[PDB]
Amino acid sequence: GKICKKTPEQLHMLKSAFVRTQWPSPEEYDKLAKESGLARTDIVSWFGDTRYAWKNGNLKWYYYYQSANS
């Protein structure tokens, strides 16, 4: 009984996956499902949601990661 459907560890994995590639290959989605325990259709949807926020200035955690990384 939680609001955040995905666990912190699951979420932290998706964010780390997002930073390497924002358009994962068909096989990379399978792997992320396998290692996260999440259903593939949710991983695919989450990348869509994330990319949508990303192009509209609502993905601060990524921008801030880039302004410290590169």
Numbering used by the authors: 662 to 731
Which lines from the publication concern this structure?
ZHXs are multidomain proteins comprising two C2H2 zinc finger motifs and five homeodomains. In transient co-transfection assays ZHX isoforms have all been shown to function as transcriptional repressors. Whilst many 3-D structures of homeodomains have been determined by crystallography and NMR, we report two ZHX homeodomain structures which contain novel features.
Removal of the His tag was important for crystallizing ZHX1 HD4. Inspection of the crystal structure of ZHX1 HD4 (OPPF_2265) showed that, in addition to the normal homeodomain secondary structure, an extra helix is located at the C-terminal region. Helix V in ZHX1 HD4 is positioned almost normal to both the plane of helices I & II as well as to helix III/IV, pointing away from the DNA major groove binding site on the latter. The fact that ZHX1 HD4 helix IV is ordered without the bound nucleic acid ligand could be a result of the presence of helix V where its interactions with helix I may help to anchor helix IV residues. Helix V is also unlikely to directly affect DNA binding as it points away from the expected major groove binding site. The two molecules in the asymmetric unit of ZHX1 HD4 crystal are related by pseudo translation, which was detected both by MOLREP and from a native self Patterson map.
